[PDB]
């Protein structure tokens, strides 16, 4: 069924591809994911808009809005993408998670470091357990009878 | 996630020096009355608008406590309507049914190569 | 740590330094009911109850039957934003 | 469920290396082959629907 994708392909510009754009106001730029050819300009002609991406948001968590019924359809047509694009789509579950830099087999020291961090989090939990039994908003110390408030978050 | 990474923070009396303020009451000290309707629109409205429809922030996702996985039943969507009215008596025939797809002389389905209209969804 | 001068406070709540090319500021939020305007009272009545009203006309002019014996016909055209219990039954069964 | 499941991650690591190629290349080529299978699955599903 390659006949159905003929129009999409452009001889002058090139084959279709998926990338991002840079638009908005100076100082508050936001990424916009669209579909275009290879030689097309970064900000110009576009075939279809897939979504957007906001790496900086007031809440502090990166947002990502995408179309689940369009990305899968475009991939079947034979549309490539950059390395960075694959990583973001992998987390969403649309495509297999690509390997990180230097591969996975070399990730030897990180495995041990991650275990230490996980162990510390579990140990910290045990510490706070006892606190709830004798929670004291106001706790002094044997220095100058100074007041020290305690609050969780 | 906030409840998981819990910590004990000790706050002394001297750390709340800047928290206090002099004025008792508070209110808006600058009216929101726009001066230039066109100059402001093409400087702080158009660049920040990339969609042709007005969509509000969706509700948060609900997850379990023990297993920490998303649940099946959750809150529904939050559709928005202009002026409250949500009724159309003579809906037009939109072209969004077959995005980038048309019918050939043979009857088969073929694609197109055209720039989408920025105000396609804003012109019902 | 005690905050005495403004210099100490400035060097304690500021965000960590970042690169000059990457974006630093966030993206402001624009509500559907206010794009480039912020309505507010500018008169004597500056503090009073201002309830939101959502007009809702008839959904269909055809005569609908009673769902499980409970009538779901429209009685009056005046409807507030809050959903009435009678209407909540019809929408619940629709899904 | 296989490509999108946890089995895909461990499959890339268990691959035979070749002389003259970097460790990252072995996993990259293995991942590329997997990406070819998903395209056919989506294409078949879209046509059927």
């Amino acid at each position: 069924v390659r006949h159905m994708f003929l129009p999409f392909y452009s001889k002058e510009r090139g084959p279709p591809r998926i990338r991002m754009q840079v638009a908005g106001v100076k100082g508050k730029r936001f990424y916009k994911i669209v579909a275009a050819n290879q030689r097309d300009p970064r900000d110009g002609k576009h075939m279809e808009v897939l979504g957007s991406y906001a790496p900086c948001t007031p809440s502090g968590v990166e947002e990502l809005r995408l179309r689940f019924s369009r990305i899968k359809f475009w991939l079947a047509a034979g549309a490539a993408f950059n390395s960075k694009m694959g990583g973001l789509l992998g987390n969403a579950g649309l495509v297999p998670l690509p390997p990180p830099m230097f591969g996975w087999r070399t990730k030897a020291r990180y495995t041990l470091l991650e275990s230490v961090m996980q162990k510390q989090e579990k140990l910290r939990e045990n510490q706070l357990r006892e606190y709830f039994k004798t929670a004291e908003p106001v706790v002094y110390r044997q220095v100058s009878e100074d007041r020290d408030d305690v609050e969780q978050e | 996630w906030s409840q998981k990474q819990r910590r004990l923070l000790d706050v002394t009396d001297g750390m709340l020096m800047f928290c206090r303020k002099h004025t008792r009451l508070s209110f808006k000290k600058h009216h929101g009355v726009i001066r230039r309707q066109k100059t402001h629109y093409f400087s702080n409205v158009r660049p920040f608008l990339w969609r042709s429809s007005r969509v509000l922030e969706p509700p948060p996702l609900l997850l379990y406590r023990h297993s920490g996985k998303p649940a099946d039943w959750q809150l529904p969507a939050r559709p928005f309507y202009r002026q409250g009215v949500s009724g159309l008596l003579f809906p037009p025939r939109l072209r969004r049914g077959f995005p980038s797809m048309r019918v050939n002389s043979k009857g088969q389905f073929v694609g197109v190569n055209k720039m989408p209209y920025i105000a396609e969804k804003a012109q019902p | 740590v005690s905050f005495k001068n403004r210099a100490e406070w400035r060097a304690f709540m500021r965000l960590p330094p970042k690169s000059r090319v990457e974006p630093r500021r966030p993206i402001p939020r624009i509500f559907p009911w206010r794009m480039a305007h912020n309505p507010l009272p500018r008169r004597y009545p500056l503090y009073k109850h201002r309830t939101l009203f959502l007009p809702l006309s008839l959904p269909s002019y055809s005569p609908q039957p009673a769902i499980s014996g409970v009538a779901v016909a429209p009685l009056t055209i005046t409807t507030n934003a809050a959903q009435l219990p009678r209407t909540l039954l019809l929408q619940s069964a629709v899904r | 469920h296989f490509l999108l499941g946890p089995a895909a991650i461990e499959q890339q690591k268990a691959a035979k290396m070749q002389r003259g190629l970097t460790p990252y290349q072995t996993e990259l080529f293995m991942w590329e082959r997997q990406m070819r299978e998903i395209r056919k699955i989506y294409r078949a599903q879209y046509l059927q629907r």
Binding site: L94 | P70, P76 | - | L4
Partner: peptide
Amino acid sequence: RKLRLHQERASRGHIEYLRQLER
């Protein structure tokens, strides 16, 4: 039952919204 894949869960919401609008 017990849709674990992200794609399966994403499509579930689409059907629910369309069903409400259908009369």
